[PDB]
């Protein structure tokens, strides 16, 4: 106390050297990072047509949790469990002399774009979930309209990583349930009448609605300031 002094440094324009502040906003990010951010910016600035803007609508943090909880019980067999099933079947074919009905009928979420599309077309799909962030969005742009025309409930779900962890993969565009058990029939029934409520019911009104046109902050502030002082003119 008697020796240590308070010397508040003057950090003005011409005073002492400016301290090391946070320059995270001005970082010259790499080319790939700049391409990422400017692609998102451009894609949200340009007027996204309705058939793409309808993917901005996803399940809420509750319906998504409920749906993934339902599908977790129907995650397909892993490699080790299929191998164990093959040991059981190898025992059964030699001993019991039977192949079908030697194991209980499988009940798992169907996945794969080329499989779920055929299921939807044949109307065997009880419920379908679509990843909202596939890189060639053309893979699933037609899926909601196909679902609506085939009379099958679809949900533009959040994240293909969740679908991948569902189907024991890294990524999976679409995950479909086609044969659910009587125990979970009530759960699926409650899932629908809500999923189609926020997705399928509103399809005919999201088909007429474009999106995008969300200016940046520095232009939105300018537009607000121009709307003011001119509304009262």
């Amino acid at each position: 106390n008697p020796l240590t002094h308070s010397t508040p440094k003057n950090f003005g324009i011409g005073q002492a050297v400016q301290p090391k502040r946070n320059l995270s906003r001005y970082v010259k990010w790499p080319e790939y990072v700049r391409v990422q951010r400017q692609k998102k910016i451009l894609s949200i600035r340009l007027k996204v047509p309705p058939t793409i803007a309808q993917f901005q609508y996803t399940l809420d943090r509750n319906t998504a949790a409920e749906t993934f909880k339902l599908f977790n019980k129907y995650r397909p067999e892993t490699a080790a469990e299929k191998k164990e099933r093959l040991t059981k079947e190898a025992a059964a074919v030699a001993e019991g002399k039977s192949k079908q009905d030697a194991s209980p009928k499988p009940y798992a979420v169907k996945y794969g774009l080329n499989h779920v599309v055929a299921l939807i077309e044949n109307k065997k799909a009880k419920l379908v979930l679509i990843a909202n962030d596939v890189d060639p969005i053309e893979l699933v742009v037609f899926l909601p309209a196909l679902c609506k025309k085939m009379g099958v409930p679809y949900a533009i779900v959040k994240g293909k990583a969740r679908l991948g962890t569902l189907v024991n993969q890294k990524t999976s565009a679409v995950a479909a349930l086609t044969e659910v058990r009587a125990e979970d029939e009530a759960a699926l029934a409650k899932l629908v009448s809500t999923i189609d409520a926020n997705f399928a019911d509103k399809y005919d009104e999201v088909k007429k609605h474009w999106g995008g046109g969300i200016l940046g902050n520095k232009a939105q502030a300018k537009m607000d300031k121009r709307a003011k002082n001119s509304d009262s003119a």
Partner: protein, 121 residues
């Protein structure tokens, strides 16, 4: 959760882990034997009249040396082939294209002695 604080606007490549090679096979089957051992560096002496004068008076041996050898190699090679310490080595390139090395031994060895020990008087 907030993003990392950055005190410099210049983004730099992070220093990742660098591995060391563990090849599945050796680069070559067998390591090469010593390419410039003593018997390759010290080729033969020179016994011209001037070289004889140098060995008799200056306590200097004169050796023909391969062009790929340097003063350290010549010193070590002489020390190995003929057990005498050398005081200095002076190398030149003869106009016929071969190294000529004047190896001056220490004061306590006789060039005229070890020359006739080698075989040339």
């Amino acid at each position: 959760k907030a993003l990392k604080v950055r005190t410099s606007a210049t983004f730099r490549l992070p220093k990742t882990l660098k591995l060391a090679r563990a090849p599945k096979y050796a680069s070559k089957a067998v390591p090469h034997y010593n390419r410039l051992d003593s018997y390759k560096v010290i080729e033969q002496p020179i016994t011209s009249e001037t070289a004889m004068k140098k060995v008799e008076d200056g306590n200097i041996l004169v050796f023909q040396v391969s062009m790929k050898a340097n003063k350290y190699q010549i010193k070590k090679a002489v020390k190995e082939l003929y057990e005498v310490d050398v005081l200095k080595v002076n190398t030149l390139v003869r106009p016929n294209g071969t190294k000529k090395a004047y190896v001056r031994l220490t004061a306590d060895y006789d060039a005229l002695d070890i020359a006739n020990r080698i075989g040339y008087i």
